[model samples]
Target: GSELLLLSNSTLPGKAWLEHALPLIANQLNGRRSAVFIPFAGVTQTWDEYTDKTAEVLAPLGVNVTGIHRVADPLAAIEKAEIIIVGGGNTFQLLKESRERGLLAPMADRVKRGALYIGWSAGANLACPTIRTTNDMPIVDPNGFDALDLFPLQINPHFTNALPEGHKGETREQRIRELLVVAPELTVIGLPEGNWIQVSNGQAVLGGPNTTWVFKAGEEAVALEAGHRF
Candidate 1:
């Protein structure tokens, strides 16, 4: 079975959980022949820089790395890849571009076919049914917005209760609570910094340092920390 590694916010900093988690993921692809890094939205700066740094980090470990832009052919990249790693960026833009380029369905099929898929933050968000639940502001149109649907739940990446001065009062938890009112049938996951959800063989598992929050219709929130398996 293939697993989806979904990380929360704070992956940009080298000191974050990404430092530890990425190596473990690299180990999974170590013996594999090759791997590919797909940076969809933040292709301009953030994605480019992150992909370069990640390549540098993984190269010494003998992992063949490649970065494919949205303008480039995604299927060709996927066809040549043994593993697919999606970096974090703007979730809306990523989803929009993926759908537009006809790469979403093929990408989903690759994952279902047991191609190891790794994602962090916004990358994590796109694995769900919709990107509306993400912490990022809706900077783009929601018309026809759809995720890869690798998991049935709606993901709120970088989930946290705290906010800076002048920021909106609505916390991540509150936003998810509000979403449940509209789509009560949907399962929601609040993945904080360093936390991730793994879905394989119809089972979803939570991992990492912080707790993962789950909110369902007509029920109180549940937090699963380390050692707790879903």
Candidate 2:
């Protein structure tokens, strides 16, 4: 069976969850080669920096990591990979690149073939059917904004609903509420930092320390805590 690991962005810099989450994913690979994709915005530095940073994190886990640039043949890379990891970044840009480079179809094929598909933040958002539900500001053009649709639901990563009064400009929950008006039928999963949704064999399970929010049309939002499966 295949598995999809979707993680929210950590508020902490240097992506604090990488230490804990990467190890767990490493265990699953068992020795198979892994490839990390950084098509999304804000995920990678320069092309050289992206390759170096990916190698630094994945080398210790005994996985061969490579960054597929826009010019590279993504289908060929996907065929050689045992695991496909998408990094956090701008969701709109990610979708645009995927479409422009024609990478989504092949990548989706790999996921269905049991390749472990993992993502964080915008990467997580891209796993769903649409990227417009994300909590981040829409900084990029929406003309090519469509997700990989690996998961049936929509996601708002790095969910922060417990903010103090007047702490920040607006809460993420409020932003999500506004998006719901546009796409009411889509189920929005609010994943906090350090938390993720694990999908395996057609079942979806929530993991990590924080709870996940499931917002449906015409209903109050529901929280699915760790260990809860839907």
Candidate 3:
């Protein structure tokens, strides 16, 4: 299994960037000397700028950090990184760009070989079996629904169970219910904002604050908390 730190969101209101993620990241990547940060999840931002900001946020972690865009060959950078980190953004854009750049499959292979993998939001969505479970609008076809498959199940990140008064669209739970009708064999994890999932040596575990929901066919969504393993 991939040693992965898959986060729900990069930050919350009134908190520092990666405030909830930094410690868990430090523990998982303690001995790593360097990392390759991918900033392509969203197209509205510049890679060089985001990399500079991210470097400051991660500066105390005892490792050298570089953006994949800075390298002559991003595929080569991912191939040799001791750690891999992907920030969150638009899911469709993330996949479309990554696939167009031909970095998706190479990334999957690097993580498979035990490169510590870390992602937030859309990045986390990329780690699942497919991008079908993501909650983003389709800005572009993602080449295919295929993803890294580092985790056997699907994941719904930045999840919420709230129903605002008088608003209507299917409840988040109802949406997933519809998805299960045809894919009974599949499971989807609803990772709420501020919560994260960790896959270390093949174990699917939980981290951060708030409970996580696991949805499956014929069973109600189950809530799991920090330190809980699926």
Query: How many pairs collide in each candidate, listed in order?
Result: 0, 1, 0
Cα TM-score per model: 0.86, 0.87, 0.95
Which portions of model 3 miss their true places by more than 4 Å? none
Q: Taking the tens digit of each residue's C-alpha lDDT, what string does model 3 give over 1-230?
A: 67999999999779999987888888888588688988887667798888887888888887677998789988889999988888888888888888889998899899999899899999899999888889988988878988888877888998897988998889988888888987888898999999888887668788877888999998988988898987
Best by lDDT: 3
Lowest summed lDDT across 10 adjacent residues in model 3 is found at: 200-209
Q: Please provide, for model 2 over 1-230, each residue's C-alpha lDDT reduced to its tens digit, 9 standing for 90 to 100.
A: 55788878633456544775776566567567777566456544675575566577777788777777742767888877788878777777777777777778788888888788878788788888878777656766756566788888888888878777678666777777777788777778888888878886677888888778988877798978899987
The deviation in Å at residue 110 for candidate 2 is 1.6
Q: What is the lDDT of candidate 2?
A: 0.75
lDDT of each: 0.73, 0.75, 0.86
Top model by TM-score, which number?
Answer: 3
Better of 2 and 3 by lDDT: 3
lDDT per residue for candidate 1 within 1-230, as digits (tens), equals 65676666535455843675666575556366566786765745866676786677667667677876632766888876777777777777778777876778888888888777788787888888888687765676635768888877788887777889888777677878888888889878787777777665556667778877888878889977865656
Clashing residue pairs in candidate 1 are: none
RMSD of each: 2.8, 2.6, 1.4
